[PDB]
Design a protein around this ligand. Structure first.
Ligand SMILES: Cc1cc2nc3c(=O)[nH]c(=O)nc-3n(C[C@H](O)[C@H](O)[C@H](O)COP(=O)(O)OP(=O)(O)OC[C@H]3O[C@@H](n4cnc5c(N)ncnc54)[C@H](O)[C@@H]3O)c2cc1C
Ligand SMILES: Cc1cc2nc3c(=O)[nH]c(=O)nc-3n(C[C@H](O)[C@H](O)[C@H](O)COP(=O)(O)OP(=O)(O)OC[C@H]3O[C@@H](n4cnc5c(N)ncnc54)[C@H](O)[C@@H]3O)c2cc1C
Lengths: 453, 453
C-alpha cells in the first residue's frame, strides 16, 4: 500500500489522514504536541466559547432596551468559565480527533517531532526519547503556524500573552493592552472587554487594514461604543514590566495595563523541518510554496494549511488536506477558493466572500457597488441596533454578484447565502427576485441587491 | 390611463399601488383604518420588537454560562417598552407606507370602507361620512384577514385578547393562558413568558400540527425547558371572567389566569365587500379564490395577500400584489412559491422551505432524509445549547435537495442558504462540497448534507 507520511494533526493533517486511508494507503501521522492542533485546542473552539460567554456578559450589562429592562454589572468567575471551556475543548478533542485517529487502525500515530532526513524519509525525535525513521512514498507537511512576536524593545523579556495564554487565563485582567489589529487580536480584545477588562487596542494603521475600509470603520465605531479604546496609527516603542504591571511607551504616551496580548500575526512552523534536505522551497515569510494541488517543489511532498500561504481558516486547511490526500493517492484534485467565506467573530460580526471593490479594480475588473447601512435593514431597526452594513460588488457589464462584505450581527450566517449566489453565478437582479424572510438579517442581501436598479 | 382600484394598504396593496403607478396607471387606494395594514401596525414589526425585548430579558434571567456569569431577575417596565415599541412602529409607518403613498401623487388615497357596487365600480363609505363611487377598469382586493374566534361558551363575553390587544398591552400579566398553537400564538406565548408571565398554552393537538412533527417536538421541549406549560391535546370547554381573572374549564382541569390570548388562526376579511355583486367567488373558509396570476372568477378583479388562501407572510403578500399589478396593467406574471422560506420567531427559531418528508410522499415523490440534531453542530456545542435540529429532504433518485426544516437559533438566517440551493436545483453532494464558515449555524446545512454519503 502507498506509504503516506503526515506531519501534524490539525485540520489539514486530519483531513489528509482520513482521506489517504479511505484510498487504501498506509498512514503514519507524526504529532509533536497535543492531538488536534490549533483550532480545537487553542484556537477556534476555545475563542468562540469565550466570545459567547462575553456575549452573555455584555447583554447583561447593557442593551438597546435598557429603558424598560434593568441591566446589572454581572459578577464574573473566570475560573469557572475557564473550567467549563476546557471541559468542552477536551470533549471535542476526544470525539473528533483522538477518537477518530484511534478509530482507524490503518493510521499509525507517532508522538514526536519530525524533520526530513532526506527526500524519501523523516527522522522523528520521539517525545519519550530516542529516534525513529519514517519512510514514505508521499508526505504531507501540515505543521501550522505560531504567534508572531514583533521586535519591540523589552517585549521579549516581559511575561506577555499570545492568544494561547489569553485563552487559558484563569482571571480577567483589570486592564488589558492589545498589540495588533488582526482577526485574533480583535476577537479577543472585545471578548475580554465584555468580560470586565478595560481594553486598549494598538493598531499600527487602521483595523482590518487589508480589508475594504468600511469594515474597519464599522468595527472601530462598535468597539468605542462599548468602551474599548482603539488607538489607530499607534505603536509601542518600548515595553517594560514592573510592580505587577506592563508599562508601554506609545505614540499616545505612556500606557499601563495588568496584562499584554500580542496578536500581530502567525508565522508558519518550518524551522524544525530541515526542508532543505528534501528540496522543499519556502517564500520570504517562511511559508511553504505550493501549487493548486498542494504540491511543493518536491513533487512527492505536499503542504497544506497554516504552514503555507493559504488563508488561515480551519475549513481551508481541511479542504487543502483532503485534496492533498487525493493527489498523493493517484487522484487529481485542486483547491478552489472562489466562493470562500471569511468570518470574524466580533460583535457585530464581519463576513466577506469574493472580491472587494479595490481587489476587483486591482485585477482590472469594472464594477459597481451598493452599501446598505443597517439603519435600512428591518431586523436591525427592530433590534434598535443599526451599526454595520451589507456591501455588494458586481461586475459592471453583466451585473453578476462577485463580492459581498458585511459587518452586522449574524453576518457569518448571511454571508453563506451570498457565497452560494456567487457560486451559482447569479446577478443581483436574480438574487433580489428571490423571496427572503422579512425581519431576518439575510433579508439585507435582497434589499441591498434591489438598490442596483 | 388605466384606472386601477386597490382595496387595502398592507403589503399586498402597497406593492400593487407602486407597481401599477410604475406602469403609468392611475391608482385609487381605499383604506378603512390605519395606513400600512397588519404587518407594520399590529403584526410583524411590533411582535418582533417584543420578541427581541423578551430575548434580552431571558438572557438576563438565565444562560448556559450561569456557572461563571451571575444572572438576575430583570426588573421589567412594560409601559416604557411599549412606548419604545410604538415609536418605532410609527416611524416605520411614516417612512415606508404613508410617506410612500404621499410620495406618488399618481396614487389617490381614500379613507373609507369599500364594497363592490357592481362589476365595474366600488361604493366607499367615507370615514368622515358620506359616500363616494370609484370606477375602475381593474381592481385588486387586498383586505387581509382578522383574528379567528373559536365558539367556546363564555369566550365571546369575556375581555380576552387577540394578538392586537396583547401587543398593545401596557402591563405583563402575572399569568397568561393562550389558546392556540399557531405561529402567532407561540411567538407571543414565549415573548410574554420571558417578559415575566407564567404562561400556559392550550393546543388542540400538538404544536405546529401542520408541520413535520420534529418541529413541534423541539419547540415543545424548548418551551418547557424555560417554564412554559404546554398542554397538548387540550381544549377549553368554558371561559368565565370574575374578580379580575379568567377561569377556564379544560381537559387538564380548572385553569386560572389574569389575561387570555386567543390565537387560533386568521380569517379573510371579505364580508364588507359584497363580493357577490361583482362575481368574485370565495371558498369554504371565505378566502377569495385566485389563480397563478392572482385573478379572481371576475377577470377584471384580482386578489392577493391574507384575504386569499396564500401563505400568510408579508413578503408573499407583497410579491402577490406586485405581480397582480403587472397583470392588471397588461403584463403577464405568476407567483412562484417553490423556494418560499417560512420563519417562526420563537427561540430557537423554526424555519422551513420546500417539501417535508410527508408532503413529498403525499405527492408521490420518493425521498431520503437526514436529521442532524444540534448536539452535532459545532456552533451549538460552543454555545452550550444543543436543542434543535436541521433536517434535509432529497429526491431519492437524483439526490436533489427539495426541502429543509430546522429548529435552531438563527434558523431564519440559515434557511435562506437552503432556499437558494433548492432554487439552483443543487444536490446535497454539491452543497456539502461548498466551503462553509466553521462555528456558524449555517455550517449545520453542510454537516447534514454530508451524512447522506
Ligand atoms: C485564537 C485563534 C482563533 C481562531 N478562530 C478561527 C475560527 O473561528 N475559524 C477558522 O476557520 N479558523 C480559526 N483560526 C485558525 C485556525 O485555527 C487554523 O487556521 C487551523 O487550525 C490551521 O490548521 P492546520 O492543520 O493547518 O494547523 P494546526 O492546527 O496549527 O496544527 C499543526 C500541527 O502540527 C504540529 N507540528 C508542527 N511542527 C511539527 C513537527 N515538526 N513534528 C510534528 N508535529 C509538528 C503542531 O504541533 C500542530 O499540532 C483561529 C486561530 C487562532 C490562533
Ligand atoms: C401578530 C402577527 C405577527 C406576524 N409576524 C409576521 C412575520 O414575522 N413575518 C411575515 O412575513 N408575516 C408576519 N405576519 C403576517 C403578516 O402580517 C400578514 O400576512 C400581512 O400583513 C398581510 O398583508 P396583506 O396586505 O395581505 O393584509 P393586511 O396588511 O392585513 O391589510 C389589509 C388592509 O385592508 C384594509 N381593509 C380590509 N377591508 C377593507 C375594506 N372593505 N375597505 C377598505 N380597507 C379594507 C385593512 O384594514 C388593512 O389595512 C404576522 C401577523 C400577525 C397578526
Amino acid at each position: 500500500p502507498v506509504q503516506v507520511a503526515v506531519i501534524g494533526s490539525g485540520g489539514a493533517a486530519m483531513a489528509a489522514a482520513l482521506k489517504a486511508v479511505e484510498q487504501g494507503a498506509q498512514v503514519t501521522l507524526i504529532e509533536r504536541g497535543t492531538i488536534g492542533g490549533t483550532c480545537v485546542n487553542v484556537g477556534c473552539v476555545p475563542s468562540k466559547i469565550m466570545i459567547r460567554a462575553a456575549h452573555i456578559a455584555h447583554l447583561r450589562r447593557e442593551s438597546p432596551f435598557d429603558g424598560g429592562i434593568a441591566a446589572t454589572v454581572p459578577t464574573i468567575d473566570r475560573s469557572k468559565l475557564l473550567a467549563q471551556q476546557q471541559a468542552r475543548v477536551d470533549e471535542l478533542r476526544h470525539a473528533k480527533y483522538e477518537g477518530i485517529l484511534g478509530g482507524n487502525p490503518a493510521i499509525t500515530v507517532v508522538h514526536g517531532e519530525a524533520r526530513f532526513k532526506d527526500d524519501q524519509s523523516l527522522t522523528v525525535r520521539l517525545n519519550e526519547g530516542g529516534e525513529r525513521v519514517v519512510m514514505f512514498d508521499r508526505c504531507l507537511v501540515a505543521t501550522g503556524a505560531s504567534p508572531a512576536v514583533p521586535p519591540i524593545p523589552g517585549l521579549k523579556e516581559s511575561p506577555y500573552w499570545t492568544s494561547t495564554e489569553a485563552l487559558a487565563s484563569d482571571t480577567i485582567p483589570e486592564r488589558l493592552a492589545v498589540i495588533g489589529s488582526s482577526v485574533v487580536a480583535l476577537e479577543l480584545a472585545q471578548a475580554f472587554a465584555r468580560l470586565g477588562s478595560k481594553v486598549t487596542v494598538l493598531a499600527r494603521n487602521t483595523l482590518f487594514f487589508r480589508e475594504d475600509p468600511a469594515i474597519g470603520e464599522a468595527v472601530t465605531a462598535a468597539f468605542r461604543a462599548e468602551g474599548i479604546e482603539v488607538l489607530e496609527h499607534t505603536q509601542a516603542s518600548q515595553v517594560a514590566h514592573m510592580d505587577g504591571e506592563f508599562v508601554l511607551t506609545t505614540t499616545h504616551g505612556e500606557l499601563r495595563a495588568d496584562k499584554l496580548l500580542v496578536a500581530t500575526g502567525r508565522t508558519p512552523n518550518t524551522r524544525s523541518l530541515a526542508l532543505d534536505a528534501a528540496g522543499v522551497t519556502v517564500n520570504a515569510q517562511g511559508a511553504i510554496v505550493i501549487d493548486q494541488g498542494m504540491r511543493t517543489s518536491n513533487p512527492n511532498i505536499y503542504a497544506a494549511g497554516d504552514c503555507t500561504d493559504q488563508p488561515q481558516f480551519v475549513y481551508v486547511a481541511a479542504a487543502a488536506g483532503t485534496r492533498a490526500a487525493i493527489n498523493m493517492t493517484g487522484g487529481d484534485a485542486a483547491l478552489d477558493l472562489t466562493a470562500m467565506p471569511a468570518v470574524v467573530f466580533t460583535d457585530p460580526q464581519v463576513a466577506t466572500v469574493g472580491y472587494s471593490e479595490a481587489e476587483a479594480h486591482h485585477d482590472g475588473i469594472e464594477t459597481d457597488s451598493r452599501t446598505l447601512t443597517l439603519d435600512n435593514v428591518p431586523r436591525a431597526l427592530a433590534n434598535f441596533d443599526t451599526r454595520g452594513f451589507i456591501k455588494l460588488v458586481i461586475e459592471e457589464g453583466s451585473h453578476r454578484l462577485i463580492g459581498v462584505q458585511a459587518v452586522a450581527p449574524e453576518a457569518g450566517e448571511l454571508i453563506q447565502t451570498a457565497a452560494l449566489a456567487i457560486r451559482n453565478r447569479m446577478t443581483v437582479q436574480e438574487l433580489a427576485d428571490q423571496l427572503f424572510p422579512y425581519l431576518t438579517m439575510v433579508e439585507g442581501l435582497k434589499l441591498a441587491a434591489q438598490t442596483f436598479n
